[PDB]
Design a protein around this nucleic acid. Structure first.
Ligand code: CA
Lengths: 596, 255, 235, 253
DNA sequence: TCTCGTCCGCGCCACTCGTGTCCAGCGTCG
DNA sequence: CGACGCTGGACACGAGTGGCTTT
DNA sequence: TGCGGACGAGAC
């Protein structure tokens, strides 16, 4: 059969082409390009997919080794060129590309030939010097042939054969990949996508995320520029990131008057997160991160204030920004009354939940007791009191195993034989096992688009508890008062019926065996599982993380202790504090193991 | 099918020491009056004109004009084979692209023969129409070469200004600044050390310095070097050769 | 204002060739006495002390003493642009950021100017050997070629290396003479010792001074008017 | 218990630096009386030998031979200090532990001493008996060095073409072919520059040029060199050492 | 010194290539 | 003949790209 | 966003 990369590419292409609503935005020429791709030999498709995953630049035919495709890949290259996907070195008519193609020794030799200022130097400075020399020095010198042409000819002759993926088909396939990745090539999906067996549901589509080809191209440009900004953050070139984000913000301001946007505001949130405006708001949040990194705290505050007035785009993160506007208003800049106003507005904001609601509140008390804000006697005006009950703390001394493994060994010595350490994945997996029938239920429109969708789009969005409220309430009330045998049967049936099916929640490698899952379910009981499943069903995005790490328990005594292990240089985040308090409310026994 | 014999063969070798760094390959025009090079550097900033008249070459006979482009570095490697005193003669076939160089010992006991690939390339034409140059300077070649090296020790550019007092080179770089001043001496004996300058116009003009270093490789050809320039014309650096030929380097303005 | 005209420019050339790699940056202290240079080497086991009076300079005027901190690489490269007989002039105004080197050949047909950007207890040594700089240079070079460390003994140089060992015994009668006041056997490194030998043309003979736990001193004397001393910390 | 002395200490230095690269980790098998060594090259294609007469040196210590396990790079390192006009004495310490080399200047005021631990030695002892060679030419060694150098610049394989009237070195490469013809000197002086020729039948055979360079590196030791060429057998190149020694190389194509 | 808050850097492994650094062979000029 | 100046080859790094699961 | 390192300020 086909290799893994080719398998993933064909699966993506087939899934996208099956999308009738998503096939319409592609131009007739782009559909012709796609159908030309299917008219290739297996070796041709393999080589094209192999070159697709590489960078978009000229690559020498010497550096093209692929034993899996063919020993001599020149006929495959010629077939691809005839098809129109690969342009050979004959089209390398740009000096800035051929110079980058040449290796460092070859570029040094070329610089020595042309009597450059610094023949022995960096490659980038060599390319810059070659461009500078090509700009002039030949217009009038005693015919008028451009020296740039001579440099290009010499560099092309030196580099030999070289191919590069064409702009058009590459862009078309990038947009196809983007359309596939809307519902979620990434490495996790580059390999094993042909063998992953997604869950079963009925595809139901009613609305169009994009209305025409121009909208999809705009969204692709926005997400590509967001990816460029993200790469700039990853590589640490924060000034380039700031420039790119400024250009993106000016583009967004230019585009804010587009009437097509007036349709995107009518999309549901879980579908509205796939629009150009959403991507530009995410880019503006990354711009806020850049400004905070580069210490324009006032400009970061202004950007956050502008963002916080846009209730249509990214409302779920409205907490992240409210908290940072408070921190960028009190810590980095010493404003105090505006910080109190920001805290009050954030606490009154319905979109701030869990940790980012606690953090603001903590800032609130940090301004209700500090002497610097004594004159501002308003933070006590309403300030809806939220209190997290303290949990037990146990200290451990020890020191080659991991910290969590050491804590697991400790609780093994203390009479808790069975113990697992998957943090959220232990509770998320259990919630998925218990509520697979409701998470992937039918009747909810616009949440199942493709067939390779590991999770309904309602997840990570409050609407998951709005569309399926009856069934979810019925299940969470049935689990609340249920015998251990019924819970065992439910978990066993879910595990048997759906074994190996990928899902965003259930991790089949978390439990070493089904018996461990059964024992954990029996020990946790009804109320604890009902509480955690309800808190994950309502606002899953803000309750996804911050869960305790180890679940340790004994089979005979049926005693468990959800333990959150903090290392010697660790601290309880607000999400973790909220989750520990919630588990304390549920009757579960929870404590913090501080390892020294 | 042409034959060219020369006694003081090292002279020819000296020529190969000068072109090799500047031009990797050049067109070797053949004529009854003399053999010309008429090539220019790769980077299109400098020209080299080499003329060896047939009068100096004993037993010179050429049937027709030939292009016979030559890889200069390869020819220098072949010419390194001989010594400083061997007599050198070159033979070119009627149509075969094989130039044969044979060198005979000064005592006529060691004879060496070699052949070259003699690659064929394009033969362009650069007019360099005769322009009347000004501020002609005649100075020893060694002084000029070491001045060029000293200035290249500092920066990557040079400026030359000629006035009634003399000639002045200058070079300013990031590391530092420097300049050379030479004054006309008018030696009575004229032991090739005169720095006599004729003055017609006080001009000043800028050039690159690496190409001056590549031009300085022709110093062993002769003691005297002639540098001429004007307001806008290219700099001309001429070395005579055994009263039979010349080698000229023209450099374009830096700006 | 300050001028210093030296006919023997080769002397300046070789003395700054000696300090080419010993020190990266150093200052040329100038007073009415002359030009003094007390420099801390890049390595942390050596010191440099160059002394020259004001008598040998054809012209000397020091209204205000100037540190004259010059990057030795840059000024050595500038000095490389002067001939052996090239008369060398050091100039620097009291409020000048740049130092000027004026090179004028004795034949006077040529004149050039360059501008560069300006930026131990005493104790008599128990033993001292005055021997030609060539001999000690060859000994140090060969014994560094055989090993990394050499011990000097009352003369004997013994180098220890991973490959093997070497031992050279000298004699006394361009002459070599030792006070033989005390016996010593003290080890020393070679890399800095090798660097201390680039001053072979700088002087005729070197007086290696050693004693009990006193730092090693090598001395190169200009034919007159000045001298140079390198101090090395014993191992 | 082995002692050798040479007033002209230079010749040993040139001999040792000549072999500093053509053989590494070589063997020294000097007998009780008479100095000799032989070793196959690092490429296992060519052989190098040298014979120095024991009575040619100044003195000798009456004892038995020992491995004298010598390594050239180490020796060269040690011998690099030795001058080209001083007296050199080689002394052997028992138990095959070290070898000492003492260099004393003629002025007897800057005397020196040296020594070095040796290394494990393996005896190969090829000992190929000599066979008669047809073509022989004696010519100055500097001429051979220049010829080898320029042919290495222009080619990769050297052709001998021994002949009665003279010799003709021929080769070729990507930059064309090269031929150099040396005629009989036929001068009354018969100096080292003069070349003599003795032929019985011409022999043509191509030889490698890199090892030819490695062997001509021994040019400064001898004023002249004798080349013996014969078909189907390695070329002989031979150097004379003050008529007190012979340094030979066998070059198999 | 101790405690709390805040910021900064993270796919993964191997394979090749850019890069500044160091050592040994080379032409030379007193 | 040798010491000095010049220069190219060899070398430990860190950065960048590429392949990751036809089993 | 979720992890782990680090440093900086208030109170000793
Ligand atoms: Ca943890």
């Amino acid at each position: 059969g086909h290799p893994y990369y080719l398998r993933s590419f064909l699966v993506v292409l087939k899934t996208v082409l099956e999308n009738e609503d998503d096939m319409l935005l592609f131009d007739e020429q782009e559909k012709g390009i796609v159908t030309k791709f299917y008219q290739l030999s297996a070796t041709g498709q393999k080589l094209y997919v192999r070159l697709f995953q590489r960078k978009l630049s000229w690559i020498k035919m010497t550096k093209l080794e692929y034993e899996e495709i063919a020993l001599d890949l020149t006929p495959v290259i010629e077939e691809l060129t005839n098809a129109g996907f690969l342009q050979t070195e004959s089209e390398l008519q740009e000096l800035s590309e051929v110079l980058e193609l040449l290796s460092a020794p070859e570029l040094k030799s070329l610089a020595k030939t042309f009597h450059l200022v610094n023949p022995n130097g960096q490659k980038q400075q060599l390319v810059d010097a070659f461009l500078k020399l090509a700009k002039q020095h030949s217009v009038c010198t005693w015919n008028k042939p451009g020296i740039g042409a001579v440099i290009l000819k010499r560099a092309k002759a030196l580099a030999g054969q070289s191919v590069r993926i064409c702009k058009g088909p590459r862009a078309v396939f990038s947009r196809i990949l983007l359309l596939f990745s809307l519902t979620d090539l990434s490495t996790v999906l580059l390999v094993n996508l042909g063998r992953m067996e997604f869950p079963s549901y009925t595809i139901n589509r009613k609305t169009h995320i994009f209305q025409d080809r121009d909208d999809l191209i705009r969204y692709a440009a926005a997400t590509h520029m967001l990816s460029d900004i993200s790469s700039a953050m990853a590589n640490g070139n924060w000034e380039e990131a700031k420039e790119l984000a400024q250009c993106a913000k000016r583009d967004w301001n230019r585009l804010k008057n587009h009437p097509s946007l007036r349709c995107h505001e009518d999309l549901p949130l879980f579908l509205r997160c796939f629009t150009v405006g959403w991507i530009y708001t995410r880019i503006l949040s990354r711009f806020v991160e850049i400004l905070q990194r580069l210490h324009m705290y006032e400009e970061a505050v202004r950007e956050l204030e502008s963002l916080l007035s846009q209730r249509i785009y990214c409302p779920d993160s409205r907490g992240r920004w409210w908290d940072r506007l408070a921190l960028n208003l009190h810590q980095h800049l010493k404003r105090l009354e505006p910080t109190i106003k920001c805290i009050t507005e954030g606490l009154a904001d319905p979109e701030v939940r869990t940790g980012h609601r606690l953090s603001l509140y903590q800032r609130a008390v940090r301004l209700r007791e500090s002497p610097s804000c004594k004159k501002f006697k308003h933070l006590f005006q309403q300030l809806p009191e939220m209190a997290v009950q303290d949990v037990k703390h146990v200290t451990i001394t020890g020191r080659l195993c991991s910290v969590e493994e050491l804590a697991l060994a400790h609780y093994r010595r203390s009479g808790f034989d069975q113990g697992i350490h998957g943090e959220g994945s232990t509770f998320s997996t259990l919630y998925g096992l218990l509520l697979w029938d409701i998470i992937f239920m039918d009747g909810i429109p616009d949440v199942f688009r493709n067939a390779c969708q590991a999770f309904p789009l309602d997840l990570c969005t409050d609407s998951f508890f709005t569309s399926r409220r009856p069934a979810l309430e019925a299940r969470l009330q049935l689990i609340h008062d249920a015998p251990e045998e019924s819970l065992r049967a439910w978990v066993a049936a879910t595990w048997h019926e759906q074994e190996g099916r990928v899902a965003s929640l259930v991790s089949w490698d978390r439990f070493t065996s089904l018996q461990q899952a059964q024992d954990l379910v029996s020990c946790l009981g009804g109320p604890v599982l009902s509480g955690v499943c309800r808190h994950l069903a309502a606002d899953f995005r803000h309750c996804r993380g911050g869960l305790p790490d180890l679940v340790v328990w004994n089979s005979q005594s049926r005693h468990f202790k959800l333990v959150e292990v903090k290392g010697p240089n660790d601290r309880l985040s607000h999400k973790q504090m909220i989750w520990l308090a919630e588990l304390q409310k549920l009757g579960a026994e929870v404590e913090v193991c501080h390892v020294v | 099918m042409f034959e060219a014999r020369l006694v003081q063969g090292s002279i020819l070798k000296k020529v190969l020491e000068a072109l090799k760094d500047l031009i990797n390959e050049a067109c070797w025009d053949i004529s009854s009056s003399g053999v010309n090079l008429q090539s220019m550097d790769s980077s299109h900033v400098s020209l080299v004109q080499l003329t060896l008249r047939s009068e100096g070459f004993d037993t010179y006979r050429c049937d027709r004009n030939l292009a016979m482009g030559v890889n200069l570095t390869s020819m220098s490697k072949i010419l390194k084979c001989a010594g400083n005193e061997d007599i050198i003669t070159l033979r070119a076939e009627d149509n075969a692209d094989t130039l044969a160089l044979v060198f005979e010992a000064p005592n006529q006991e060691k004879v060496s023969d070699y052949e070259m690939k003699l690659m064929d390339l394009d033969v362009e034409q650069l007019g360099i129409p005769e322009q009347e140059y000004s501020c002609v300077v005649k100075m020893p070649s060694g002084e000029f070469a070491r001045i060029c090296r000293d200035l290249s020790h500092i920066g990557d550019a040079v400026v030359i200004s000629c006035a009634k007092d003399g000639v002045k080179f200058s070079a300013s770089g990031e590391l530092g600044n420097g300049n050379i001043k030479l004054s006309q001496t008018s030696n009575v004996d004229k032991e090739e050390e005169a720095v006599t300058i004729e003055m017609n116009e006080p001009v000043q003009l800028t050039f690159a310095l690496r190409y001056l270093n590549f031009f300085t490789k022709a110093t062993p050809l002769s003691s005297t070097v002639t540098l001429s320039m004007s307001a806008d014309v290219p700099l001309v650096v001429e070395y005579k050769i055994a009263d039979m030929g010349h080698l000229k380097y023209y450099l374009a303005p830096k700006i």
